[PDB]
Amino acid sequence: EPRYCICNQVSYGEMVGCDNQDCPIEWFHYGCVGLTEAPKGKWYCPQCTAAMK
Ligand SMILES: [Ca+2]
Ligand SMILES: [Zn+2]
Ligand SMILES: [Zn+2]
């Protein structure tokens, strides 16, 4: 029921959480952010990565 990610679709498949506390979206599908495997440490989504540089 809740929609997640930049794509605004329900949770499906492998999901990753952005570790920036102010991330507006928080939860993303792996594919929508270019991942194939679980991050081995903290992970920041592309939008938060752009905001942190
Ligand atoms: Ca949304
Ligand atoms: Zn998505
Ligand atoms: Zn984020």
User: Measured between alpha carbons, how far is 34 from 37 in angstroms, rounded to an integer?
Assistant: 10
User: Measured between alpha carbons, how far is 36 from 29 in angstroms, rounded to an integer?
Assistant: 10
Q: Which domain holds residue 41?
A: 1-53
Structural domain total, the chain: 1
Nearest ligand (C-alpha, residue 51): 3
Q: 28 alpha carbon to ligand 3 midpoint, in Å?
A: 9
Residue 17: which of 1, 30, 34, 2 has the closest Cα?
30
**18: CB partners within 8 A, 6+ apart:** 25, 26, 27, 28, 43, 44, 45, 48
Structural resolution in Å: 1.2
Q: Are 5 and 16 in contact (CB under 8 A)?
A: no
Expt. technique: X-ray
User: Measured between alpha carbons, how far is 53 from 37 in angstroms, rounded to an integer?
Assistant: 24
User: Measured between alpha carbons, how far is 5 from 29 in angstroms, rounded to an integer?
Assistant: 6
**Helix H or strand E segment including 47:** helix 46-52
